[PDB]
């Protein structure tokens, strides 16, 4: 996020980091319950990647994070990678995450819910702060 | 470029698809929702993360970081996967697995 700010540690409990087998963070994700993570289909996740929950400082070794294995990758069949439409993938964890103060689920909207233009929302992540 | 060690956050406004089309044209589809062009921008590595909106103390996933400006320009709207257009599929997949 460019021009964002540091978050209060653990205040976005559903925010997970998708890391490859080398520990490199390549995408964000959101826990919707103890066994499922919602992310973007274009993140190209495979079962060799891992879901890390409870993390704040990726340069810190003192955080009690949960490195969770991915059992299955569900890429929405409607996903069109060339137009990047219906960009969503579900990740089923091999073992359930342990919910706590720093790890919990975000709510999903009803398909008919209306979110008006002008509404202020928030986005989080470990993406570049400067391009 | 610079990658942060610590989690970042930013508040930003939702745009209408019609208005967003003023920046992206036909690239904008019904299953997408734009936000930003407000002085902040999601950028490489934010992909897949949440775009949440608060109402009555609770946060709902309205978008998933998808794509946008090749240079993460803060005056261009970021494009997110519109969760309302994809939640039925989410519910179904979970119920079936």
């Amino acid at each position: 996020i460019v021009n964002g700010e540091e978050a209060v540690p653990g205040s976005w409990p559903w925010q997970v980091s998708l890391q490859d087998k080398t520990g490199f963070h390549f995408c964000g994700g959101s826990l919707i319950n103890e066994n499922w993570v919602v992310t973007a289909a274009h993140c190209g996740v495979t079962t060799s990647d891992v879901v890390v929950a409870g993390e704040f400082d990726q340069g810190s070794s003192s955080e009690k994070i949960q490195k969770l294995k991915i059992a299955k990758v569900f890429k929405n069949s409607k996903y069109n990678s060339l137009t990047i439409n219906n960009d969503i993938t579900l990740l089923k964890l091999s073992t359930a995450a342990s919910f706590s103060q720093t790890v919990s689920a975000v709510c999903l909207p009803s398909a008919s819910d209306d979110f008006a233009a002008g509404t202020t929302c928030v986005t989080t992540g470990w993406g570049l702060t400067r391009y | 470029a610079n990658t942060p060690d610590r989690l970042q956050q930013a508040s930003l406004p939702l745009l209408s698809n019609t208005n967003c089309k003023k920046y992206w044209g036909t690239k904008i589809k019904d299953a997408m929702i734009c936000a930003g062009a407000s002085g902040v921008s999601s950028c490489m590595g934010d992909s897949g993360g949440p775009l949440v909106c608060k109402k009555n103390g609770a946060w709902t996933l309205v978008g998933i970081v998808s794509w946008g400006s090749s240079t993460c320009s803060t005056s261009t709207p970021g494009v997110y996967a519109r969760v309302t257009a994809l939640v039925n599929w989410v519910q179904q997949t979970l119920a079936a697995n």
């Binding site: 209060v8 653990g10 409990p13 706590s100 709510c107 | 949440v52 609770a58």
Partner: peptide
């Protein structure tokens, strides 16, 4: 869902 135990501060 959706209510962090540790309240975010913008």
């Amino acid at each position: 869902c959706g209510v962090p135990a540790i309240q975010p501060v913008l």
